[PDB]
């Protein structure tokens, strides 16, 4: 029934029923006065763009341009959109990004696990991040000191050879050749077999 | 829809392999360990007091 979240070092776990984001925003807007609360200047600049049109002003109820306060509806919609950025309801994803990320990380991480309880479940893998991440950080640092950057060295990350005409995440199985050459982690993985 | 124990068994596979001699050191044979075995889930304890 309850949900417990205790990420803080010095604070006990919070106790809420469901929909933690919406519950937190509603409780903080209801139990205490939210008029004095002002968000960052980024939200203030977004407020000008939202106010400049009548339909958007009606939708978001943003009446005062100079006021630094942000209404509950705008924040809730922004949070919902940010959550929706990854998952698309059009097609059912087989597995979440965390599953594939854990697989790709633990494919390297298998060597140390043989000295400990072999994990047959994801939860045991999740329970060993503090003991596993330092190895990944060390090898990432070593690769950073090792790469010569045969690809364009403007930035060192993934998904850089995307075709300018293509503007969709899903393949149109088919992969354009050389799409992921610029990533350095895939280079390290291929080097390691 | 759920899979049988056989398919997840075959997928999970084995990862260890050890060689053990008999008491007299007459014969040597290997043992296999399956990661999906119920033996792992039981969490039994072990000791060898002298």
């Amino acid at each position: 029934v309850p949900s417990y979240f205790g990420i803080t070092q010095n604070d006990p776990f919070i106790r809420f029923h469901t929909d933690f984001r919406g519950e937190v925003v509603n409780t903080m807007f209801e139990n205490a006065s939210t008029w004095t609360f002002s968000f960052g200047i980024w939200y203030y600049r977004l407020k000008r763009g939202l106010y400049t049109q009548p339909r958007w002003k009606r939708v978001y109820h943003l009446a005062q341009m100079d006021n630094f306060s942000i209404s509950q509806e705008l924040l809730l919609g922004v949070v919902n959109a940010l959550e929706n950025v990854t998952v698309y309801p059009t097609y059912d994803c087989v597995l979440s990004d965390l599953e594939a990320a854990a697989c790709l990380l633990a494919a390297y991480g298998h060597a140390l696990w043989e000295g400990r309880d072999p994990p047959d479940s994801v939860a045991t893998v999740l329970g060993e991040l503090p003991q596993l991440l330092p190895r990944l950080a060390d090898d990432v640092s070593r690769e950073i000191a090792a790469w010569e950057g045969p690809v364009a060295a403007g930035n060192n990350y993934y998904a850089y050879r995307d075709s300018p005409d293509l503007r969709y995440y899903m393949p149109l199985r088919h992969y354009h050749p050389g799409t992921f050459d610029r990533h350095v982690l895939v280079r390290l993985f291929h080097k390691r077999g | 829809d759920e899979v049988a124990r056989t398919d997840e068994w075959k997928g999970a596979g084995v990862s260890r392999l050890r060689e053990v001699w008999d008491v007299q050191h007459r014969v040597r044979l290997r043992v296999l360990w399956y990661v999906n075995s119920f033996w792992r889930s039981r969490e039994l304890s072990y000791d060898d007091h002298e």
């Binding site: - | 050890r18 053990v20 001699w21 008491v23 360990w33 792992r40 072990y46």
Partner: peptide
């Protein structure tokens, strides 16, 4: 123990500490 049709047999003994020397030590 291994048994063959003619009744002959051969056998030998193990110590559990040798079989489980490291697999159980992890758990």
């Amino acid at each position: 123990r291994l048994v063959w049709p003619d009744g002959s047999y051969r056998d030998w003994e193990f110590l559990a500490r040798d079989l489980l020397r490291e697999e159980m030590e992890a758990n």
